């Protein structure tokens, strides 16, 4: 999979593809790679799909618990530190790679966090399988200071190069734009590089084209007195 | 009054914990312990009563040392004060391992006050009943505290406790008057003795033995040690001369 | 005097705390099981009510512990709550291990130990709950029991717990029939509940009802909790309303 | 008749007599505190009553530095004062490394308050007799004062006062805020907000103060320091001079 | 003992009213007061909670 | 008898339970009114000094976005127990069920924390009776009272605290089987003004609803498939609006 | 929303700066524009859901009445606002109709009208409406008979109401009834029962739930 983050002035964007591969076979063509930590923190998953999914959930409940407890807005900053701690404890026996970014009152932040518990800050990051293919697009085409417009265009371009050169990155691009003091905009299937090709015959046939031996009703509900 | 003792965590209506006040009363029956802080040191002197004239003299101390630089003397029950210093040696030692330096005197003050406070907070232990005067020398100079069995502490220029606190606080009160400057640790050795000698008229039934200790930055290399030999004899001559 | 903790006996070999725990029971409403070879009815009465107490959205004196054993509750509902969870958890533990829905006897015997256990060990309070256990197991057919808060059990053909235990018991045994009908068993429960309870009219909303039957379609076991409207209609038939 | 010889056993009015005798232990050192809000600071000025001359005054304090941006003023007794101060410090530390940011005035006061409730919940500890008032300028709330009580009740404030003569302090403050029609002091540097707290306290008590007889802690934006006796002294002739 | 006191309260409400006749509205208030008061000896609706 | 959690009485029951009930009655007055598309929950604030910030007291605390609460009883007990309630709700029923729990289920967990604080002698139960109102997609809008006796009851309209007894008949009289939320919000203020006068105003009465989904509070958009917070806290300015049209 | 807003502003500029004459025409448009909203033949002129508009319409039409200077015309309009009340067919009527009448009492409209308007509201308010709406009108009707100096007609109504609300007394509203009654009896010149009712109102104001106005009275 491919995941990027592009820091811009008025917020930060996190984009990631929808396809999920577990072996050489595609598990899902469409399934979310933007998991919700808190209403203003989002993150995308790479690596082993099970480890990323579990972690995000585990940390997510804690940051919603924290919001209520500190009686103030959820920090990105809280989240990373807590998450880092969590990751450390397994000693790298959990295979989660994430890009976490968000807006909080300290501002926009864009972090990378590894399975080991190595932690990084940049103004442009990526992780995953297709990270080397996107990284090339960011370093060249990015400059410091951007509008909303340029950031969204640059984010979808990187995943798009991702799909075309990376095997495990495929299908559509889902983009989430978190601007400072505004709603996250979850734009499902912003970009399609290649739409579906159809099959050339109808494969639906009559019954008795598949053999039956017995026909039964199995219970699923409680009978009355009738 | 009646009620709200028999427990050591039960508040009184007045707003107090009775049993904790009865602690201080035990400390009063204990023998006189004073500390005089000095400008480049501290001097601790203590009145060690003679049970009978079969006692071995200068072989029993209520002075104990903590780490290698912090003096402690307690008044109150003799073994309770011991028990509280042992805990203190382990705590000073953990600090010392952890940070690779000797304790600050403010550091020790915090730690000790938590261990006394812990036994006033729970229902299955009797609170301590000792005061313990302690101090020494650090980077930040000399410092002296006196920790009450209530778990209360402050710094002192000079501190006294025991049966002789009536005499001793008064002598120290003259000492600040005559010297607001500080008074050298040497001249305070000779002073330490006179203070005890007048505080021994509150325990006049028995005879006493005078033991002086000190810790001074420039005349003991920051280290605590017993004052003995010629220094100890001079202080005796000083106290004897002026009492008559 | 001996009205203290549980280790201590009275010199008459009475533990006062089991005796008082019995007496807890008759400060919560009447609860009746009547056994019949056609089925068991469990019927219960509300301890108190008001005109804006909601009691048509849920039961809270009839709990299913599993899919063949269910209980009526009389007594402190707080004490009840923990014991119902422990019973129900065990009911499914039996399911996991043997692939059979738990026998009525094993379940009563378990809970009798547990009640006993809170009296016998430690400083913990005894329980003041009477559960009428009504079950099916394919050993003994239809089964009724009730358990004391004391932590023992007896099987019955009719039993009443909760408030007004003596009278409610008397009217039940007076008109009881050995074979009975399921339909008559429901009627005898309203007839008794009327005279024992100090509510002026006996309303559908002061009643909870559940029936456990294998005669409402055989091959299968059907637990039928009556909804408010079914309760409301059957009062009409018996002409209380 | 049963019911302050136990922590947990209620009275027949539904009060806990023992817990309330802790609200009544805050008079045991007999000091008064005032903390008020300015417009870029939170000030706390409490008495320093050094009773004896055998004491060295510069170790006498009630204002504790809890953390980089957090102070706490204690009214009530010294033994419990120190227990309150270590726990709040210990928690300040825990919050920063666990959740990776500074600790606000709310977050600390709520946590201590919940902690007081736990200590009253069991019968295996007692309540403490100390009243805690936390002072800070918060990262997005600005000036904040949160009073944490011995039961574990907390409410925020524009101004609060504590101590034996607290009632006399309270009327003077009420009249000020009523007349001004703001929930703040509009003096725009902390050196005059401090002067304002001294000013109201002299009038309430009827007493002059001197260098040894006051303690002043100042929460400023993003930093905190407790003032020496000679800086307090500068403030005190600023009052006298108009 | 309740029911003789209901009649005492009603007759004292009826005095305020100043009529030979005692109306039934006085017997609505007398019940609502005797009844409310006995639910304060039971500490709310404690039968419900047990 | 009365006077341990351990001792049963001759007519039974623990006395500590009865005394904890007494505590509630010394409380403030909170009340809930179920409408057909909401539940309104209302209470007042007091603090003694007027120098107190009132927006710092917690008494209307969302446990989840789906489920709000109030209390009557001990103030300290509330904050601690709200804290605990939330914590349990994610462990047993948001890591498992995958969403914030049912109104019925969550009320049972709250009762279970109480119950543990009755079983263990020398440990008193919580000073509070809460009202917990919420919404779920199965049992609809719902309202409960959960007593410090560790039992909970469902209710149509109810009030608790000192002023309960005065409020309940107003509730009997003024409740009708079909109401809107807006007629419930006005009935709520009206009844609560019986509890106190001389101090009732839109900045000192705290009133909230668990009404209809609001995507305004969701804080992320472009996901139509989930709902937004049912909960809404009305500001001080809204409470003044409703008090003028009344 | 936008449109009714503009129409309202436009009439208002004419009233105070040019003449009232020109504002009448705009007032006619305000009535038609409201009429569509009320019966909802365009979704209230915002499609689908009535929305904001359902409220906006009745509010701006009671603003119109009050403006305005009493006219002979204005008389005729006001008891027909009760047809307009039922037109929406809503339960949020209760609150607005209480205010609405309150507006009309302030501007004097002579003997018949103030009483005539109130009796028409009460007919519609016991067709299917609340007990709450009904009682607020009853307090008002009682006040109207007093102001016209009808002491038999005032006193008889106060009695018909009150005796039923002694059986169901839970209202902070009966302090008001008690005070009216006392005034009634004072102006018939009997002090026996002027005294008796002032005591009553005072007993009713012991539990404290009274507006400023109520205590002043």
Other C-beta atoms closer than 10 Å to the C-beta of B36 total: 29
3-state secondary structure of G10: helix
A94: left (phi over 0), alpha (psi -120 to 50) or beta: beta
State the number of CA atoms in the 13 A half-sphere of A219 facing the CB: 7
What is the distance between the alpha carbons of residues E44 and E36, in angstroms, rounded to a whole number?
Answer: 10
Helix (H) or strand (E) holding D186: none
Identify the CA nearest to B70 among candidates B95, B52, B47, B51. Answer: B95
Identify the CA nearest to C104 among candidates C53, C149, C70, C64. Answer: C70
> What residues contact residue C15 under an 8 Å CB cut-off, 6+ apart?
C6, C8, C9, C119
Identify the CA nearest to G64 among candidates G30, G98, G37. Answer: G30
Cβ separation D173–F123 shorter than 8 A: no
Sort out which chain F residues have CB atoms less than 8 A from D158's CB and list them. Answer: 51-53
Cβ separation A222–C216 shorter than 8 A: no
Going by their DSSP bridges, the two strands F231-233 and A184-191 should be labelled as unpaired
Core vs surface per residue C182-197: b (16+ CB within 10 A) or e: bebbbbbbbebbeebb
Identify the CA nearest to C79 among candidates A153, A25, F118. Answer: F118
What is the distance between the alpha carbons of residues B230 and C9, in angstroms, rounded to a whole number?
Answer: 74
Identify the CA nearest to G181 among candidates G199, G207, G206. Answer: G199
Check whether domain B1-244 has CATH 3.40.50.280, yes or no: no
List beta partners, residue A176.
Answer: A14, A186
Other C-beta atoms closer than 10 Å to the C-beta of F245 total: 12
Identify the CA nearest to A99 among candidates A16, A202, A172. Answer: A16
What is the distance between the alpha carbons of residues B74 and B76, in angstroms, rounded to a whole number?
Answer: 7
Q: Are F26 and D10 in contact (CB under 8 A)?
A: no
How is residue A186 written in tokens? 């979850």
Helix (H) or strand (E) holding A145: none
Helix (H) or strand (E) holding A97: strand A96-104
Number of helices (H), then strands (E), belonging to chain G: the values are 12, 0
Q: Greatest CA span in chain B, whole angstroms?
A: 56
* Through-space distance between the first and last CA atoms of chain F, rounded to whole angstroms: 50
Count interface pairs B-D at CB distance under 8 A.
90
What is the distance between the alpha carbons of residues A28 and A49, in angstroms, rounded to a whole number?
Answer: 11
What is the distance between the alpha carbons of residues A118 and D56, in angstroms, rounded to a whole number?
Answer: 51
| Beta strand segments in G85-169, E | none
State the number of CA atoms in the 13 A half-sphere of C199 facing the CB: 21
How is residue B39 written in tokens? 């400008």
Q: Measure CA D210 to chain center.
A: 21
Cβ separation B10–D24 shorter than 8 A: no
> What residues contact residue D224 under an 8 Å CB cut-off, 6+ apart?
D65, D68, D69, D70, D71, D136, D217, D218
Q: Angle formed by the axes of helices D78-99 and D105-121, to 10°?
A: 120
Identify the CA nearest to F44 among candidates F210, F240, F204, F243. Answer: F204
DSSP D203: H
Other C-beta atoms closer than 10 Å to the C-beta of C39 total: 24
Write a three-state SS string for chain C.
CCCCCCCCCCCCCCCHHHHHHHHHHHHCCCEEEEEEECEEEEEEECCCCCCCECCCCCCCCEEECCCCCEEEEEECHHHHHHHHHHHHHHHHHHHHHHCCCCCHHHHHHHHHHHHHHHHHCCCCCCCCEEEEEEEEECCCEEEEEEECCCCCEEECCEEEECCCHHHHHHHHHHCCCCCCCHHHHHHHHHHHHHHHCCCCCCCHHHEEEEEEECCCCCCCCEEEECCHHHHHHHHHHCCCC
Identify the CA nearest to C135 among candidates C109, C111, C97, C107. Answer: C107
Dihedral angle of Cα G73, G74, G78, G79, to the nearest 10 degrees: -40
Core vs surface per residue F175-195: b (16+ CB within 10 A) or e: beeebebbbbbbbbbbbbbbb
What is the distance between the alpha carbons of residues G200 and G179, in angstroms, rounded to a whole number?
Answer: 8
What is the distance between the alpha carbons of residues F143 and B181, in angstroms, rounded to a whole number?
Answer: 75
Q: Angle formed by the axes of helices G53-66 and G93-106, to 10°?
A: 10
Cβ separation E47–C28 shorter than 8 A: yes
Sort out which chain C residues have CB atoms less than 8 A from F150's CB and list them. Answer: 78, 81
Q: Are F196 and F175 in contact (CB under 8 A)?
A: no
What is the distance between the alpha carbons of residues D126 and B10, in angstroms, rounded to a whole number?
Answer: 8
Other C-beta atoms closer than 10 Å to the C-beta of G196 total: 15
Would you list which residues of chain F are within 8 Å, Cβ to Cβ, of chain C? 1, 5-14, 104, 108, 111-112, 114-115, 118-119, 121, 139, 142-143, 149-151, 153-158, 168, 171-172, 175
Count interface pairs D-F at CB distance under 8 A.
97
> Of F150, F155, F156, which has the smallest distance from its Cβ to C78's Cβ?
F150
What is the distance between the alpha carbons of residues D158 and B157, in angstroms, rounded to a whole number?
Answer: 40
Going by their DSSP bridges, the two strands D131-138 and D71-75 should be labelled as antiparallel
Core vs surface per residue G42-68: b (16+ CB within 10 A) or e: eebbbeeebeebbbbbbebbbebbeeb
How is residue B232 written in tokens? 């100890």
Identify the CA nearest to C61 among candidates C241, C222, C206. Answer: C206
> What residues contact residue E32 under an 8 Å CB cut-off, 6+ apart?
none
Instruction: Classify residue C32 as exposed, middle or buried by CB count within 10 Å of its CB (0-12, 13-18, 19+).
Output: buried
Please confirm, yes or no, whether A1 is among the known catalytic residues. Answer: yes
Q: How far is F126 from chain G (nearest CA, A)?
A: 32
What is the distance between the alpha carbons of residues D95 and D102, in angstroms, rounded to a whole number?
Answer: 7
How is residue C3 written in tokens? 């009205």
What is the distance between the alpha carbons of residues D80 and A95, in angstroms, rounded to a whole number?
Answer: 48
What is the distance between the alpha carbons of residues D50 and B201, in angstroms, rounded to a whole number?
Answer: 29
Q: How far is C70 from chain A (nearest CA, A)?
A: 16
List beta partners, residue F44.
Answer: F205
3-state secondary structure of E35: helix
Sort out which chain F residues have CB atoms less than 8 A from A184's CB and list them. Answer: 219-221
Q: Are A189 and A159 in contact (CB under 8 A)?
A: no
Going by their DSSP bridges, the two strands D71-75 and C62-64 should be labelled as unpaired
Q: Are F29 and F162 in contact (CB under 8 A)?
A: yes
What is the distance between the alpha carbons of residues F58 and D153, in angstroms, rounded to a whole number?
Answer: 10
Q: Are B215 and B71 in contact (CB under 8 A)?
A: yes
Core vs surface per residue D59-89: b (16+ CB within 10 A) or e: bbbbbbebbebbbbbbbbbbbbbbbbbbbbb
Sort out which chain F residues have CB atoms less than 8 A from C54's CB and list them. Answer: 143, 154-156
How is residue C180 written in tokens? 């009975």
Cβ separation C50–E45 shorter than 8 A: yes
Helix (H) or strand (E) holding B140: none
How is residue B54 written in tokens? 């079969």
Q: Are D121 and B155 in contact (CB under 8 A)?
A: no
> Of F25, F57, F80, which has the smallest distance from its Cβ to D14's Cβ?
F25
Going by their DSSP bridges, the two strands C70-75 and C129-137 should be labelled as antiparallel
What is the distance between the alpha carbons of residues C38 and C181, in angstroms, rounded to a whole number?
Answer: 6
Tally the residues of chain A: 226
What is the distance between the alpha carbons of residues F212 and A141, in angstroms, rounded to a whole number?
Answer: 46
Going by their DSSP bridges, the two strands D131-138 and D142-148 should be labelled as antiparallel
F120: left (phi over 0), alpha (psi -120 to 50) or beta: beta
Identify the CA nearest to A5 among candidates A110, A77, A143. Answer: A110
Rounded to the nearest 5°, which phi and psi values hold at B235?
A: -65, -35
Alpha-carbon separation of residue D221 from D88, D218, G116 (angstroms): 20, 10, 67
Angle at A149 between CA A143 and CA A153, to 5 degrees: 75
Q: Which residue of F has its CA nearest to A188?
A: F222
Q: Measure CA F141 to chain center.
A: 14
Question: How was it solved?
Answer: cryo-EM
Give D232-238 contacts, CB < 8 A, sequence gap 24+. Answer: D235/D191, D235/D194, D235/D195, D235/D198, D236/D198, D236/D209, D236/D210, D236/D211, D238/D191, D238/D192, D238/D195
Helix (H) or strand (E) holding G128: none
Cβ separation E49–F151 shorter than 8 A: yes
Going by their DSSP bridges, the two strands B33-38 and B158-161 should be labelled as antiparallel
Rounded to the nearest 5°, which phi and psi values hold at B75?
A: -120, 145
What is the distance between the alpha carbons of residues A6 and A14, in angstroms, rounded to a whole number?
Answer: 7
DSSP F217: G
Helix (H) or strand (E) holding G141: helix G131-147
Alpha-carbon separation of residue C184 from C35, C36, C166 (angstroms): 11, 9, 22
Cβ separation F8–C24 shorter than 8 A: yes
Identify the CA nearest to C137 among candidates C89, C186, C165, C101. Answer: C101
What is the distance between the alpha carbons of residues G99 and G124, in angstroms, rounded to a whole number?
Answer: 16
Tally the residues of chain C: 241
Touching check for G49 and chain F: CB below 8 Å? Answer: no
3-state secondary structure of A4: strand
How is residue B204 written in tokens? 């006049």
G68: preceding bond cis by omega (within 30 degrees):
yes
Q: How far is F40 from chain A (nearest CA, A)?
A: 21
3-state secondary structure of G119: helix
Angle at D114 between CA D110 and CA D119, to 5 degrees: 145
After what residues is chain D interrupted, C–N > 2.5 A? none
Identify the CA nearest to C24 among candidates F1, F6, E46, F13. Answer: F13
How is residue B117 written in tokens? 């406070």
Residues of B acting as catalytic residues: 31
How is residue C152 written in tokens? 């023992």
Best mutation target among D6, D17, D155 (most F Cβ atoms within 10 Å) is D155
How is residue G169 written in tokens? 């007394």
How is residue C28 written in tokens? 């919560």
Dihedral angle of Cα E37, E39, E44, E48, to the nearest 10 degrees: -170
List beta partners, residue B45.
Answer: B34, B212
């Amino acid at each position: 999979t491919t995941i990027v983050g592009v820091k811009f002035n008025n917020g930060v964007v996190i984009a990631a593809d929808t396809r999920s591969t577990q072996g050489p076979i595609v598990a899902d063509k469409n399934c979310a790679k933007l998991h919700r930590i808190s209403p203003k923190i989002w993150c995308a998953g790479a690596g082993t799909a099970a480890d990323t999914e579990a972690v995000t959930q585990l940390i997510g409940s804690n940051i919603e618990l924290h919001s209520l407890y500190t009686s103030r807005e959820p920090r990105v900053v809280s989240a990373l530190q807590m998450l880092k701690q969590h990751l450390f404890k397994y000693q790298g026996h959990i295979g989660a790679y994430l890009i976490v970014a968000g807006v909080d009152p300290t501002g926009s932040h864009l972090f990378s966090i590894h399975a080991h518990g190595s932690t990084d800050v940049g103004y442009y990051l990526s992780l995953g399988s297709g990270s080397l293919a996107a990284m090339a697009v960011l370093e060249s085409h990015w400059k410091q200071d951007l509008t909303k417009e340029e950031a969204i265009k640059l984010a979808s371009d990187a995943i798009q190069a991702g799909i075309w050169n990376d095997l495990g990155s495929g299908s559509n691009v889902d983009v989430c734009v978190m601007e400072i003091g505004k709603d996250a905009e979850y734009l499902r299937n912003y970009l399609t590089p290649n739409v579906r090709e159809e099959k050339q015959k109808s494969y639906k046939f009559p019954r008795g084209t598949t053999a039956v031996l017995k026909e039964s009703i199995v219970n699923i509900c409680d009978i009355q007195e009738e | 009054g009646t009620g709200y003792d028999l427990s050591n965590s039960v508040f009184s209506p007045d707003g107090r914990n009775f049993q904790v006040e009865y602690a201080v009363k035990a400390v009063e029956n204990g023998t006189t312990s004073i500390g005089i802080k000095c400008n480049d040191g501290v001097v601790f002197a203590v009145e060690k009563l003679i049970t009978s004239k079969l006692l071995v003299p200068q072989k029993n101390v209520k002075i104990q040392v903590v780490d290698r630089h912090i003096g402690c003397v307690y008044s109150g029950l003799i073994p309770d004060g011991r028990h509280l210093v042992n805990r203190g040696r382990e705590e000073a030692a953990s600090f010392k391992k952890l940070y690779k330096t000797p304790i600050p005197i403010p550091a020790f003050a915090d730690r000790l006050g938590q261990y006394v406070q812990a036994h006033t907070l729970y229902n299955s232990v009797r609170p301590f009943g000792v005061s313990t005067i302690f101090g020494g020398v650090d980077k930040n100079g000399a410092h002296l505290y006196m920790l009450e069995p209530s778990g209360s502490y402050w710094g002192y220029k000079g501190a006294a406790t025991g049966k002789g606190r009536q005499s001793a606080k008064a002598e120290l009160e003259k000492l600040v008057d005559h010297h607001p400057e500080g008074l050298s640790a040497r001249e305070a050795v000779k002073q330490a003795a006179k203070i005890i000698y007048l505080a021994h008229e509150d325990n006049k039934e028995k005879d006493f033995e005078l033991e002086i200790s000190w810790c001074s930055l420039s005349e003991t290399n920051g280290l605590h040690k017993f004052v003995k030999g010629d220094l100890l004899q001079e202080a005796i001559d000083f106290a004897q001369k002026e009492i008559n | 005097r001996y009205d203290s903790r549980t280790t201590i006996f009275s010199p008459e070999g009475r533990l006062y705390q089991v005796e008082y725990a019995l007496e807890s029971i008759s400060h919560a409403g009447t609860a009746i099981g009547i056994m019949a070879s056609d089925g068991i009815v469990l019927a219960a009465e509300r301890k108190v009510t008001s005109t804006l107490l909601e009691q048509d959205t849920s039961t809270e004196k009839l709990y299913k512990l599993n899919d063949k054993i269910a209980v009526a509750v009389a007594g402190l509902t707080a004490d009840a709550e923990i014991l119902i969870n422990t019973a129900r958890i065990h009911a499914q533990n039996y399911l996991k291990t043997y692939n059979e829905d738990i026998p009525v006897e094993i379940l009563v015997r378990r809970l009798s130990d547990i009640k006993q256990g809170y009296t016998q060990h430690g400083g913990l309070r005894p329980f003041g709950v009477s559960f009428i256990y009504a079950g099916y197991d394919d050993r003994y057919g239809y089964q009724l029991y009730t358990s004391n808060p004391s932590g023992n059990y007896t099987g019955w053909k009719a039993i009443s717990v909760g408030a007004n235990t003596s009278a409610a018991q008397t009217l039940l045994q007076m008109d009881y029939k050995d074979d009975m009908k399921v339909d008559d068993a429901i009627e005898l429960a309203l007839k008794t509940l009327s005279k024992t309870t100090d509510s002026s009219a006996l309303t559908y909303d002061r009643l909870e009802f559940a029936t456990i039957r294998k005669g409402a379609n055989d091959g299968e076991v059907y637990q039928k909790i009556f909804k408010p409207q079914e309760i409301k209609d059957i009062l009409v038939k018996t002409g209380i309303t | 008749a049963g019911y302050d010889r136990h922590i947990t056993i209620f009275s027949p009015e539904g009060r806990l007599y023992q817990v309330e005798y802790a609200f009544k232990a805050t008079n045991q050192t007999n000091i008064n505190s005032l903390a008020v809000r300015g417009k870029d600071c939170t000030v706390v000025i409490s008495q320093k009553k050094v009773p004896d001359k055998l004491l060295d005054p510069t170790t006498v304090s009630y204002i504790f530095c809890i953390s980089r941006t957090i102070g706490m003023v204690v009214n009530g007794p010294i033994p419990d004062a120190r227990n309150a101060a270590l726990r709040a410090k210990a928690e300040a530390a825990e919050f920063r490394y666990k959740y990776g940011y500074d600790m606000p005035c709310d977050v600390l006061a709520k946590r201590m308050a919940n902690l007081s409730q736990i200590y009253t919940q069991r019968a295996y500890m007692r309540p403490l007799g100390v009243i805690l008032t936390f002072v800070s300028v918060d990262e997005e709330l600005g000036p904040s004062i949160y009073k944490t009580d011995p039961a574990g009740y907390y409410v925020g404030y524009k101004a609060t006062a504590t101590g034996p003569k607290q009632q006399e302090i309270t009327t003077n403050l009420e009249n000020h805020f009523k007349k001004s029609k703001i929930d703040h002091i509009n003096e725009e540097s902390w050196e005059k907000v401090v002067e304002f707290a001294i000013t109201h306290m002299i009038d309430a008590l009827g007493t002059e103060f001197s260098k040894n007889d006051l303690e002043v802690g100042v929460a400023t934006k993003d930093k905190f320091f407790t003032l020496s006796a000679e800086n307090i002294e500068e403030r005190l002739v600023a009052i006298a001079e108009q | 003992a309740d029911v003789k006191g209901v009649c005492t309260e009603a007759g004292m409400y009826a005095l305020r009213e100043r009529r030979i006749h005692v109306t039934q509205e006085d017997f609505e208030l007398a019940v609502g007061k005797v009844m409310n008061k006995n639910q304060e000896t039971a500490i709310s609706v404690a039968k419900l909670f047990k | 008898y009365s006077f341990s959690l351990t001792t049963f009485s001759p007519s039974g029951k623990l006395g500590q339970i009865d005394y904890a009930l007494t505590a509630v009655k010394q409380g403030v007055t909170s009340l809930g009114i179920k409408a057909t598309n909401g539940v309104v929950i209302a209470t007042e604030k007091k603090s003694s000094s007027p120098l107190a910030m009132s927006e710092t007291l917690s008494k209307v605390s969302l446990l989840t976005p789906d489920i709000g609460a109030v209390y009557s009883g001990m103030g300290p007990d509330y904050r601690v127990l709200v804290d605990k309630s939330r914590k349990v709700a994610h462990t047993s029923y948001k890591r498992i069920y995958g969403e914030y729990p049912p109104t019925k289920l969550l009320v049972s967990e709250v009762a279970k924390i109480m119950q543990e604080a009755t079983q263990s002698g020398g440990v008193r139960p919580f000073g509070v009776s809460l009202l917990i109102a919420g919404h779920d997609e199965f049992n609809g809008f719902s309202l409960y009272q959960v007593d410090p006796s560790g039992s909970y009851f469902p209710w149509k309209a109810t009030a608790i605290g000192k002023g309960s007894v005065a409020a309940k008949t107003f509730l009997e009289k003024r409740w009708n089987d079909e109401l809107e939320l807006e007629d419930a919000i006005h009935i709520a203020l009206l009844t609560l003004k019986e509890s106190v006068e001389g101090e009732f105003n839109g900045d000192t009465i705290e009133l909230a609803i668990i009404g209809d989904e609001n995507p305004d509070l969701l804080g992320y958009t472009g996901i139509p498939t989930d709902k937004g917070p049912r909960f809404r806290k009305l500001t001080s300015q809204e409470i003044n609006d409703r008090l003028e049209a009344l | 929303m936008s449109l009714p807003g503009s129409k309202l502003e436009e009439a208002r500029r004419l009233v105070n700066e040019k003449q009232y004459n020109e504002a009448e025409q705009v007032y006619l448009s305000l009535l038609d524009k409201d009429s569509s909203q009320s019966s909802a033949a365009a979704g209230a002129s915002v499609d689908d859901k009535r929305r904001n508009e359902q409220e906006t319409s009745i509010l701006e039409l009671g603003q119109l009445y009050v403006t305005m200077g009493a006219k002979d015309k204005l008389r005729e309009f006001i008891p027909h606002s009760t047809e307009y009340m039922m037109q929406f067919a809503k339960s949020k009527t209760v609150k607005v109709l209480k205010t609405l009448i309150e507006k009309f009492e302030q501007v004097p409209d002579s003997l018949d009208d103030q009483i005539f308007v109130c009796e028409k509201s009460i007919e519609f308010a016991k067709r299917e409406k609340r007990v709450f709406l009904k009682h607020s009108l009853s307090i008002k009707l009682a006040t109207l008979h007093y102001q016209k100096k009808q002491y038999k007609d005032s006193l008889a109504l106060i009695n018909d109401l009150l005796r039923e609300f002694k059986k169901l007394d839970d209202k902070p509203s009966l302090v008001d009834v008690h005070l009216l009654e006392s005034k009634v009896y004072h102006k018939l010149r009997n002090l026996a029962k002027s005294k008796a009712s002032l005591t009553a109102a005072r007993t009713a104001a012991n539990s404290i739930y009274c507006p400023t106005q109520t205590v002043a009275e």
